[PDB]
Amino acid sequence: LSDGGVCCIDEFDKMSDSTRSVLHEVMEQQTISIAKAGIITTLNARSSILASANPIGSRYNPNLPVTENIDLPPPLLSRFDLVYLVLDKVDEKNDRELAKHLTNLYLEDVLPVEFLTMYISYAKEHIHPIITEAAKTELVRAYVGMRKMTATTRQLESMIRLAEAHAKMKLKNVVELEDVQEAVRLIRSAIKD
Amino acid sequence: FDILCVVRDLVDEEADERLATFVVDSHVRSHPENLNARQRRLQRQRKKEEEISPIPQELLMKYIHYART
Amino acid sequence: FRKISRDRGIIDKIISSMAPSIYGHRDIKTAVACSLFGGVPKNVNGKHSIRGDINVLLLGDPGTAKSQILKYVEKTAHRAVFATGQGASAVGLTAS
Amino acid sequence: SDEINELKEMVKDEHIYDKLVRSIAPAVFGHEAVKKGILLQMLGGVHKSTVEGIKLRGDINICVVGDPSTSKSQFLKYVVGFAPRSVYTSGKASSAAGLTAAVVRDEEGGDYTIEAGALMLADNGICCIDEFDKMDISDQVAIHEAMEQQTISIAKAGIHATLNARTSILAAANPVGGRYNRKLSLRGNLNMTAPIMSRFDLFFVILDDCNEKIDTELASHIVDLHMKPPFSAEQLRRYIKYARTFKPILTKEARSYLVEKYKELRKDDAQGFSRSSYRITVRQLESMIRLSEAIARANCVDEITPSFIAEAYDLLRQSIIRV
Ligand SMILES: Nc1ncnc2c1ncn2[C@@H]1O[C@H](COP(=O)(O)OP(=O)(O)NP(=O)(O)O)[C@@H](O)[C@H]1O
Ligand SMILES: [Mg+2]
Q1: Whose CA is nearest to atom 16 of ligand 1?
Q2: Inter-chain residue contact A24 with D98, CB threshold 8 Å
Q3: Is D270 on the interface with C (CB under 8 A)?
Q4: D1-323 CATH choice from 3.40.50.300, 3.40.50.12370, 3.40.50.1000, 3.65.10.10
């Protein structure tokens, strides 16, 4: 039902390997290759999954990498483009500024979502970036870098899709080096594991 | 099941060579391309069956049915 | 049939003829011959009926012609039917 | 007449055999051995009937083993996009019924009927299964008949049948735990067991490991495919359709050579003080025949040279020599 839109899934770390095995062909083929009694179909479902997941148990262990914490296997994490840690660790500076940020909500009488979703929609209708050689060179180089950091072409394909997504900003409609650099850089924040 | 047959795939060189030769010979003897024209190829087919079978299968089926009934 | 049967070698000529393009496996071919001819069913005074049929199990390794032996018998027997594994059900096997 | 000229140029170009393999799976870089096997599967061996009525299988069954990041699923989607009479399903999210055939009530007549599963739709065709190792054993033991006896035999609900399942199976498999380990046998790398592994003709083990020149070339190909082969699909399919009209015969010099090369595989497979077999059953001798027939079709020759036996012998060694 989320064909052509974001599928948000919470509690994702607790999901059984069978259901993940179905999501494999979503992330690989964006369609479901059913075959049951009377029903055979390749059911197209082009959803950008936004999973929300946890370390096993009550807390993340900072002395361990994200794979050892999340307990989902590494190649499942390699399906996703970006993987993030958001952690509750005590810091009076961050906790003061977050508490201020939250408590400011009760004071006041592009922010609004109506313009954001309009802008995203118009970008989807109008902006379809082609790739320039200044992007190609960094794509090939950066993948070969993290491959001998130990990586797969799924990271390279992720970099391509992210660079194209980055190239939809400013109605740019052309991918260049900076798009690849930010796609690669945000992946360097993730692939460290 | 008041007879049991136990069947094992042991590697055994002189058994495997005779088996493999037989299987290859059987494959070519079963290949598609291999007193009129119809009867003539049936006669060749009969001799091909006699290459391995002491009695014809067509005879054996009627012999089975007779012996049973 | 009468003529060929009185050959003192007829049993082994039959058993060799069983599944002829299957090499060796002479104990299987013997058991298949025995099953396919069967025993004699009996009933003592009408009180005690006795099975005449002979049941045979081929237990063994992959790629040893067991399925092909069954497919041979399917062509060779007068009344027969062939069923495989999860293709069967209890009622589909006995009656429904 | 111009299509006839294409076929004439194809048989005239006597090193066509290499061009065919490079025309397989054009979206996928490298993996020449898999591409060769896929060609031989689509060409198939020759179906045969024996004097006792016993059929001997023509179809070639292949399994492609590798890491989930690999090009494996793109091989399946190539064959599904290219080959006539071909079907696609996943090992999980499918059932033994939807695989061989189901038994259901007819909405019109009200009584029971057979309901065709994928291995019937792929009859005289190809069946492509993704995530095959992640299929239930309930369903892996279901396809055993279709892979070898090439039928689906059913006895359910008072309806009895033996439906044809003359399909070449192509299975995408992951090793145990997802990551391959060549320190173990192919026995240990898979959750499969000898009944199903012996039913496959040959295994391609496309593990992925780093190599900077290969990796730069692969990355360049991937990026060039995002737009930063020897034949068109029509030409390739026309050749395959023509090649499928040949019915190659084993030359007598190839027969004894085949017996000995089988005996070499048979010797090298043996396990334990018992000398028990594991991978080389009699099915693998027949696999050498089917592969040599498929090669003779790939070369458009109605006779099998001993070289074709050597190529089949080498293609079967791929799944064994990684001890
Ligand atoms: N002794 C033999 N002679 C001829 N063909 C043989 C022989 N042993 C095996 N084969 C071949 O092996 C192939 C598979 O035979 P099959 O009947 O499936 O054996 P099986 O023991 O039933 N294997 P399985 O289904 O895994 O239990 C057939 O195509 C046969 O031609
Ligand atoms: Mg069997």
Answers
A1: C65
A2: no
A3: no
A4: 3.40.50.300
